[PDB]
Amino acid sequence: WLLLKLAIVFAVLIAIYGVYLDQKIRSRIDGKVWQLPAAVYGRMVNLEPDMTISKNEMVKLLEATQYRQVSKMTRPGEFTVQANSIEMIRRPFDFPDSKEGQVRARLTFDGDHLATIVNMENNRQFGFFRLDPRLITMISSPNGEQRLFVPRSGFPDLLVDTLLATEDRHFYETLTQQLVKNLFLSKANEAYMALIMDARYSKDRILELYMNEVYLGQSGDNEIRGFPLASLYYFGRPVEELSLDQQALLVGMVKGASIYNPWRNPKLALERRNLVLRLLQQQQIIDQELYDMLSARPLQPRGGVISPQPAFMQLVRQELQAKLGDKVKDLSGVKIFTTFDSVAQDAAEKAAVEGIPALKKQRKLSDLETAIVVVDRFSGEVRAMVGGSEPQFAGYNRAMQARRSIGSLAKPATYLTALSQPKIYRLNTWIADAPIALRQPNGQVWSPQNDDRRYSESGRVMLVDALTRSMNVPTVNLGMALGLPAVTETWIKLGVPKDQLHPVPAMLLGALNLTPIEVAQAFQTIASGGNRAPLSALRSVIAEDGKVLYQSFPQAERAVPAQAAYLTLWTMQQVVQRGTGRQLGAKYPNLHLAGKTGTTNNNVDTWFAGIDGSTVTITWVGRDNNQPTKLYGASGAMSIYQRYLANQTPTPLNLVPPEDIADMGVDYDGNFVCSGGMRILPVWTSDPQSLCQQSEM
Amino acid sequence: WLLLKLAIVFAVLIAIYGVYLDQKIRSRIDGKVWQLPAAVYGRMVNLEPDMTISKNEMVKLLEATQYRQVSKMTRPGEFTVQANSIEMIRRPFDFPDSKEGQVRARLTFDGDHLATIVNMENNRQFGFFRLDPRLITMISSPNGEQRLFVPRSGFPDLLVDTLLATEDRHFYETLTQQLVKNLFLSKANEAYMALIMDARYSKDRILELYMNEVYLGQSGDNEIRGFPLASLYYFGRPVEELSLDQQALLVGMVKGASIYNPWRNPKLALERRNLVLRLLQQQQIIDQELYDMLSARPLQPRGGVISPQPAFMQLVRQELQAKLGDKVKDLSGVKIFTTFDSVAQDAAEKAAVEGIPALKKQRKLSDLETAIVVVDRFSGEVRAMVGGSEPQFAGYNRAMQARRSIGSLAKPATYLTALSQPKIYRLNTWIADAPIALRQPNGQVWSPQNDDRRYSESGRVMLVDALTRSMNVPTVNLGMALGLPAVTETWIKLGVPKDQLHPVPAMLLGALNLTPIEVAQAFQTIASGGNRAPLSALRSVIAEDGKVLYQSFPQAERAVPAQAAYLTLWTMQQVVQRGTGRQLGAKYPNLHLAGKTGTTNNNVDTWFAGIDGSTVTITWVGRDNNQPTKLYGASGAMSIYQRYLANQTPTPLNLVPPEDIADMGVDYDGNFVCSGGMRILPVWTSDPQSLCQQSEM
Ligand SMILES: *C(=O)[C@@H](NC(=O)[C@H](N)c1ccccc1)[C@H]1NC(C(=O)O)=C(C)CS1
Numbered sequence A, B: 001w002l003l004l005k006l007a008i009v010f011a012v013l014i015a016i017y018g019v020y021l022d023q024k025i026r027s028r029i030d031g032k033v034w035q036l037p038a039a040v041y042g043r044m045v046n047l048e049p050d051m052t053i054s055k056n057e058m059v060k061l062l063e064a065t066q067y068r069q070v071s072k073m074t075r076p077g078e079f080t081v082q083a084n085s086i087e088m089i090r091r092p093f094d095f096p097d098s099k100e101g102q103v104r105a106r107l108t109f110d111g112d113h114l115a116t117i118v119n120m121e122n123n124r125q126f127g128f129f130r131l132d133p134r135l136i137t138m139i140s141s142p143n144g145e146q147r148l149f150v151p152r153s154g155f156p157d158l159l160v161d162t163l164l165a166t167e168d169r170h171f172y173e174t175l176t177q178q179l180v181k182n183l184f185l186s187k188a189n190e191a192y193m194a195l196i197m198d199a200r201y202s203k204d205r206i207l208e209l210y211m212n213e214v215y216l217g218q219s220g221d222n223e224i225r226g227f228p229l230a231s232l233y234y235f236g237r238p239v240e241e242l243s244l245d246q247q248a249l250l251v252g253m254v255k256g257a258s259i260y261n262p263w264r265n266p267k268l269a270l271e272r273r274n275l276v277l278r279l280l281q282q283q284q285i286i287d288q289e290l291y292d293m294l295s296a297r298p299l300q301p302r303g304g305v306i307s308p309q310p311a312f313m314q315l316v317r318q319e320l321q322a323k324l325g326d327k328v329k330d331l332s333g334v335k336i337f338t339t340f341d342s343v344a345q346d347a348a349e350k351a352a353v354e355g356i357p358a359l360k361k362q363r364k365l366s367d368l369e370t371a372i373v374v375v376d377r378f379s380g381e382v383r384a385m386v387g388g389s390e391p392q393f394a395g396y397n398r399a400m401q402a403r404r405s406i407g408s409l410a411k412p413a414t415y416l417t418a419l420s421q422p423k424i425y426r427l428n429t430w431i432a433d434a435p436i437a438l439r440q441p442n443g444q445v446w447s448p449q450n451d452d453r454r455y456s457e458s459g460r461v462m463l464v465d466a467l468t469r470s471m472n473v474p475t476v477n478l479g480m481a482l483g484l485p486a487v488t489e490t491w492i493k494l495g496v497p498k499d500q501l502h503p504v505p506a507m508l509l510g511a512l513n514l515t516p517i518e519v520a521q522a523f524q525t526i527a528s529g530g531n532r533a534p535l536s537a538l539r540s541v542i543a544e545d546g547k548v549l550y551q552s553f554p555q556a557e558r559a560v561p562a563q564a565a566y567l568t569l570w571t572m573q574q575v576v577q578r579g580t581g582r583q584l585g586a587k588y589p590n591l592h593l594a595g596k597t598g599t600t601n602n603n604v605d606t607w608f609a610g611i612d613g614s615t616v617t618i619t620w621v622g623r624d625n626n627q628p629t630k631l632y633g634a635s636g637a638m639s640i641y642q643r644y645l646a647n648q649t650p651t652p653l654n655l656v657p658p659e660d661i662a663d664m665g666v667d668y669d670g671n672f673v674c675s676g677g678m679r680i681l682p683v684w685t686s687d688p689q690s691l692c693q694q695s696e697m
């Protein structure tokens, strides 16, 4: 017999093929298994005793951070609402500062402020309590396969059993065969690889690799793979927080994700979900005492979840390039922590989605558009970005790309340049309000007019009223007295791009084309108290091994004096209370908002700059075809800001006067009085006996 | 270990695949291996003592039957030439009568006749000696693969060794691998099949199957496979009769027949032939004492050998359908024995190939054509068929397909109808030669004229002279006296198609459109002595197992009386000696040829019917466009027959007078005389005292 002898070498030749496969499995598994895309997270909110936040504001903040309201808590990422407190189970999160687990706390409130945050385990108060950030999106991997790596513990025991019942009973050496099918191949070859895989790597590793590989959905040209990313994609909570009905649907989609897609066909997807529920009940785990309760819950955010936050993600990407260059991207398992505010965004999106079609019908238009930028008053951190009236599905971001004439938003700069000189210009400084005729290099006569084409009876107005009422004629006169290079110098210090400044008399009235983000920088500089803080979207960039690649730091710069900024901010409160913006100040008088309206020529662009206790908000309302809006600054843009304020809880603006601020009294003539006077104006002076020098006449 | 245990079943699964292959090899080999195409052979010539054949005629007959002239005989199919004898080795042939082997005989001659055929082994005379037939062609197999099966002995020992040296040394268990590669497949599968093939079937069978399978050439869309058919295709002798240089070329072509094809590239083919010769010399068989003698012989008939004898093969195919129907063809290894004469054909082809371009230049024409049919005088067996001036490459066969007006070839029929009545018409019967005017159903006057438009001085001519000189006017008068139905009755008896006979006065002059084969039937009937023998191309059809499928038998039928046919034949000798055909009778007076010329109106068609001692030859010369040839009956057609007679050895016509034939004397008045007379004519009379009844006046 030369049958065995010749075919003995067949066992040898296939065994050496197995040693070749073992060498290949180790090359992949003992190291890089996948190119894990960059995880993009929102702001990490730290709660504190005596912090200004209400019970309702906390529910809205919890709900925005993927937390669920329940009557009785069991799972993490859940909360209960009481008459004066909130009980929650803060989900486990690998924070860059320190990795944390499950923390069950009670948040006791006293109306407007947070009294205590007590651990429900030991009954002890917290010095500060960390709220985990919400996962915004994932930056597209070139491979086209999107995942979120989660270890063995991260998957609950119920889900492992839900998967075991529909697929395998591990105790041999199909689960390890399916792994090698998705992980390596395009039947005999996979069964041979599974023999090696099971023998070398322990059971725990097999189900860890499988639960992060399996195909579960599709978004454009990106594969939604593995149970952890699928959980957030289909419902909106981590894999650990799933209910059994949701686990059954995720488990059911494994053998055919495309036909069990609830977005396309819900009937077949619901039918397959009940099939998983009817498979589990047959086994020792479940009884028909709740099968009809799980099968009764029909499922989902019903959106495509393709490009989450396209307006804000443009800036994130642009800043990742500015700080880390070209890689970044080579690295796998990157964690990006942004300045993004889920509360401010939903409110800004709702103000855009509802406000615009309401202004389109009201004014009888066909193509009105908008742009909203929300930044932190002091730090300059970009909290929210709205690129248009349709912020969900966007291709054009009007917050970073739409360069438009700013209009009357250019007025504070002139007054800030004047109020920078306390020895000359004060709030009671009389500005001429009489006809203007300025000959230019043409030589055509430039005769700017006031909005009503009227001039003051006495032929003058005080500085304070000129900005409050957004008067053009006194603005030019003041701006021409300081000189255009001085006013152009203020703008550079405010943070606006240098190449956009054209020093011509028209600049004082709005001949400055900026994007809402560039406008947000100029208003932030004055709102912080004169400190120019460069606007940012990146807080930190962390690697897989917890290595800090990028870490942002406070880099604020003193641009304009503190007292000049305060005097401008105080006058900006007068525009919101009595001036052009008085329609807002009547709706919210207890917010003491500092603001400025903007209306370009022929109602082409409508602008509003709103300053609360915590944020600087730039709202722009206009048409993409540069056509009339039949809208003003107070209407349109400001009515979108009022909607943004009504959609959330705004912080009231309490202006803390800095050094050398003295509230002085003036008479009808505008002269400082020792005691009394019909008007009280703040003055940048260290010795109020500026009245004595004035009263002596 | 579950390595051996799991892979022990791999030896089992491949062994059961081998038992499947053994079952498949037996299904093919133990029975039908190939669909062997029908072998088509020429006439089987039987030599006899006292037979009329010369030494030179025998050399020509041997050379035509693939026999080679040598100075010293060694191999079969060879012959030597002496002063009065021929020594030959008659090759082995499986004759239908009795299978024979190698016979070395001396053929002693006495000028014109064969004296003795003596076996050179025992020095004994033969009663009859069989000459093997030449293989004409093979009838195309639907499979498209042409072969000629030859057993193990059929291949010489030198050729087996010539093949062994270039390929294998059989003693194991590549020769059996090459077999299964060509015989079954489109490397591992063939080596596995070769293990089975070698183990079950003995060595002898392997080389028998291989030597009949191997690809050696191509002809149109037919594969020339195996050494036996390749031998005749490339050289012209059976595989047994090859020289070592020819064996080496055939052996060399095995690994690549297309690039070692001597028809396309002779340089590479000659180079590879010397490569085989230089491989054999290295081994114990050959020494450099003759390598330079074998390598010095450069090779071949240089023709395509695509469609051998297309004109004659049309009839073979047509008759195979008439006698055996649709199968035939299902059967494999069929042997077809035809009436084909290789000597008559080469001579008829040479007369067409040389004669036509010679008549084209001579007469200054551009498209002259021809057709030649040679049949056996008595049996009616078709010996040769020429379809045109280019008989090698033919698409149109003018012998079976070209229907043309016969002209003066219609004259013998009228005289045969007249000479059938001995009581009325004799050779000395006076026929009127005066103007004719026959009113027809138009009513237009038909006035036929003699070729010279002249009439006899006395106003009459004798019957004998009227046919001899091919006179039109006396032919009509004789034909109208017998009546057209009597003359139409003679034609039916002669064997011409019934639907082509139009009984109108014009028929007597050539208003009869026939093909040369149909003309061959009419002239055969009279040349045999009045016996109509249906013309045939098939002698027998034999199966592979020597089973007689078809066997032809003598089926001659008495059509016209013997004496009437003789009197017509004797007058046909007068046309060749003194009449229209006198140009032939001066070149060959000792042949006493019986003939008739034919010239249609406006020299459109030229015809000649030549009768020798053994054959009836119909020659037609005309243009395919029915245009003037500038040629007559005596010139053109008859000049092609003279070339056919000069290219071979014709049998002299010695007319044996049948019963009641008496040579009688006539005076100038044409009356029978008792003794004397200026003319001697044969008369169908049993009592010559027809002179007494005549002389009494
Ligand atoms: C600033 O934008 C300043 N605008 C104008 O002077 C433009 N050219 C204008 C537009 C409509 C009607 C009259 C003049 C204006 N400031 C505002 C404002 O507070 O929004 C408007 C309403 C007019 S003065």
Ligand SMILES: *C(=O)[C@@H](NC(=O)[C@H](N)c1ccccc1)[C@H]1NC(C(=O)O)=C(C)CS1
Residues within 6 Å of the ligand: B406, B407, B408, B409, B450, B451, B452, B469, B470, B471, B472, B509, B510, B580, B597, B598, B599, B600, B601, B602, B603, B632, B633, B634
């Ligand atoms: C028979 O073919 C008979 N032919 C004619 O009468 C034709 N019409 C003819 C052709 C040319 C010149 C005069 C008449 C003739 N038989 C032959 C012959 O023997 O071949 C010819 C030459 C003229 S009579």
